[PDB]
Amino acid sequence: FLGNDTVEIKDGRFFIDGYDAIELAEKFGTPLYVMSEEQIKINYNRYIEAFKRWEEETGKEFIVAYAYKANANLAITRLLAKLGCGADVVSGGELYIAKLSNVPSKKIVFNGNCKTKEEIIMGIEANIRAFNVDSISELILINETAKELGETANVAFRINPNVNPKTHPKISTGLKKNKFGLDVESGIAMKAIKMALEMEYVNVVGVHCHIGSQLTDISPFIEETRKVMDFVVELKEEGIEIEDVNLGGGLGIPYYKDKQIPTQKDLADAIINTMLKYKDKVEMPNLILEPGRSLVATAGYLLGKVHHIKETPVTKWVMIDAGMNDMMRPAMYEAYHHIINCKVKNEKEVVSIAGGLCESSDVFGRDRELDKVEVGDVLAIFDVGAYGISMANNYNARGRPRMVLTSKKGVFLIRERETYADLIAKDIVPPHLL
Amino acid sequence: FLGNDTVEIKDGRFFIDGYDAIELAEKFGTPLYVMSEEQIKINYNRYIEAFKRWEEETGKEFIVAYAYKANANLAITRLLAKLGCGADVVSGGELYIAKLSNVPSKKIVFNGNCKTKEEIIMGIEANIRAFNVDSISELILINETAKELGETANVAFRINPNVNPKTHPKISTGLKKNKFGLDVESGIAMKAIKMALEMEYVNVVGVHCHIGSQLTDISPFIEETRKVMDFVVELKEEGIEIEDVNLGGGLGIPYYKDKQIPTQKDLADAIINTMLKYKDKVEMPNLILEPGRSLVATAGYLLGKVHHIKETPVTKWVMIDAGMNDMMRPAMYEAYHHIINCKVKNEKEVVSIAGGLCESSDVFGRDRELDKVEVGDVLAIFDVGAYGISMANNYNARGRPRMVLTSKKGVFLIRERETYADLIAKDIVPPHLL
Ligand SMILES: O=C(O)CCCCCCCC(=O)O
Ligand SMILES: O=C(O)CCCCCCCC(=O)O
């Protein structure tokens, strides 16, 4: 319900963008991923409507670089591209898909702690907005590679702000124990940027920072912004101007439908206001965010038919043709996902929903109360648009699921399922094993 | 070093089956999975040898049903198939692979808590040794399906013995709160078997049981065998004879070279000795085991070239082209894997190894002591032959890696890598989005 603005219940049946979920499952088979085109438009517009304030009080641009790793299906990236959205790519493959999705290079940022010469060349030739440099080793490579191409590479800098360990314990730890960014306090971030300014084939264009994911509190974001901006003034004091300020992504999603969490609006006010408090010290730069889950998560639903009902002395198990290989979130993090029966019964019942993989962790939900589950029913799991198909695999020799896009134009198969032949399409038997 | 019987360090260089690891990396590229054919033969032979005692003392067969879910690369199954190994499949795709690998049907067992009608038809048509029935609901389906097909389905029953909570807490809680098997204590197992004996299209072949994975203690296997055999005795007093007894897999492998673990010999002595104690109450049946990890794990090595060396104020990172999407174990279970520099340097240093994915969990190991790491070196992470490629994915839009098999005949490519074209090979853009 909360966050799922395009779904409803017409006459005891679940609907996605007006389409009958049970019928979709019957038409395209199961397991089936269902992405809502409208929901994506809604999630994107909210980010635009809530940040339009930035191109009024600063006269600068606000760019939304969608984090491809959340879902890089061609049809989806294509759709986001058409909406004028940007792209946050983190590998040669995402850059490849981004460019194929017709996403303007001026709206493309490249992240990653291990960028290969191959990926760098791709970024330079494509003339992406910026290379969110992660280390000095990366800068030296980019610069040396641009020299080779005879071109100039745009470089931002992923920094780890001097966050206060007391106020935000986790944010501080995450920025200091991980592999990303250039530490500010130690003077490495400064060392890097200054090192770049003296190179002839790189063009410093900004700074970047990403503090986490699924954060349902503006506090960390306010703190991040402040510490990042504090570094910008420190740069100005050295005679270094920043064109762009990328604060990454990580805004939580309404997985739990009982409690209300911060919206794009709340996040906008927090950042915008914090930013403005520096309207004097430094020129207000372009603002960039790299939302992933907060753009596609609530648009995806996974449908799975129940093939068996197993009753045990302590639990009532509902077995569905959907498994952890199709959607890894539950089994990997024990994370919560709302689950319901696409058919409304005049009776409730507490059960556990599991997949068919021979892995104990292959469970979608426990002790969930749903309308009487019956063999043949189609259950639906919410919020699988982000980190669902993008992390899907063939564990237990199972092909990845089909994907359909529901739009006002109709329902379209945006991803075909894999057959048994696909499972072995990359395998080769040596001669002595034939 | 422990368990890795086909690798060595010759001239300050790491070798797999006599093949220069660095050269393999140069030739086939990185990231690269390297499977040792001889190691797999050794692991398999260790089981056959340790259990040869069974047929010599009962005249019955001892069958090894390799668990495909640990690794079902066509070449690997093809290899085990030629060794006379059996197959423990849990999906239509695994049965499909098993049958294409020329594994005899009388050496194939099918496990799974959610076997679909489609898969059951496949198992029946193939006349597999047995369906390891996971629930009464599955039993009815199998029988009904065999009926419509006008054939008989061989079935065994996966039971969950009433393991003592105090003794082995983890093992106990699993056989009670998980979705697998038929509860013994509550009488469900007995009920299912008695029920099967009435059906006209099923053939009761035996009992099955699987207690866990990566078990480095012989104690749990003894308890399993005893409680399984006690149940068999109960069936005997009910006039029900048991042809096969499948005790599943679970034997752990030496990820840690520091600790000594049980061998196949310790397992056989534990199982066979316990089994023979029932020779006076019941006729000794065929013995089946479903080794997965203990057959291929130590045969796999993942090679990753270092592209950058990042030095933070606290940790010295080494970024390689091998990522968690290639081998999900570290990032997913925070499990330990031995890692070394294929090149022996005259001095060592402590470093942390990370992949290129933008996910903080994408770290292979922290604070490891390796020979001086230098850009361009090739690192090797041990014991990735099981639950490695089988769990690989394309997270961050990265295709799964290449795999080579090293044998006495030479080194051959057994899995081709995925290109950027492969990543979208299943994606389809709808008309309004072209
Ligand atoms: O801050 C980072 O880079 C690491 C976390 C990223 C989110 C990935 C998966 C999420 C899920 O299943 O909820
Ligand atoms: O009990 C089961 O059905 C399955 C266990 C598989 C875990 C895989 C790899 C990680 C590890 O080594 O613990």
From Swiss-Prot, chains A, B:
Quote the InterPro entries the UniProt record gives.
Ala_racemase/Decarboxylase_C, DAP_deCOOHase_LysA, De-COase2_C, De-COase2_CS, De-COase2_N, De-COase2_pyr-phos_BS, Orn/DAP/Arg_de-COase, PLP-binding_barrel
Q: Listed GO molecular functions?
A: diaminopimelate decarboxylase activity; pyridoxal phosphate binding
Query: Where do the annotations place substrate binding?
Result: 293, 329, 333, 359, 387
Q: Which UniProt keywords apply?
A: Amino-acid biosynthesis, Decarboxylase, Lyase, Lysine biosynthesis, Pyridoxal phosphate
Please give the Pfam families that the UniProt record associates with this protein: Orn_Arg_deC_N, Orn_DAP_Arg_deC
Give the Enzyme Commission number.
Answer: 4.1.1.20
The PTM N6-(pyridoxal phosphate)lysine maps to: 69
Q: Which residues bind pyridoxal 5'-phosphate?
A: 213, 250, 290-293, 387
**Transmembrane residue ranges:** none
Q: Report the active site residues.
A: 358 (proton donor)
Question: What cofactors does this protein use?
Answer: pyridoxal 5'-phosphate
Q: How is its activity regulated?
A: Competitively inhibited by the substrate analog azelaic acid in vitro but not in vivo.
A single GO BP term for this record reads:
lysine biosynthetic process via diaminopimelate
Reactions this protein catalyses: meso-2,6-diaminopimelate + H(+) = L-lysine + CO2
Q: In which pathway does it act?
A: Amino-acid biosynthesis; L-lysine biosynthesis via DAP pathway; L-lysine from DL-2,6-diaminopimelate: step 1/1
Enzyme category, top tier:
lyase
The cross-references to HAMAP family, in alphabetical order and at most eight, read:
LysA (MF_02120)
Protein family according to the UniProt entry: Belongs to the Orn/Lys/Arg decarboxylase class-II family. LysA subfamily.
On assembly, the entry states: Homodimer.
Outline what the protein does: Specifically catalyzes the decarboxylation of meso-diaminopimelate (meso-DAP) to L-lysine.
Q: NCBIfam families per the record?
A: lysA (TIGR01048)
Q: What is this protein called?
A: Diaminopimelate decarboxylase
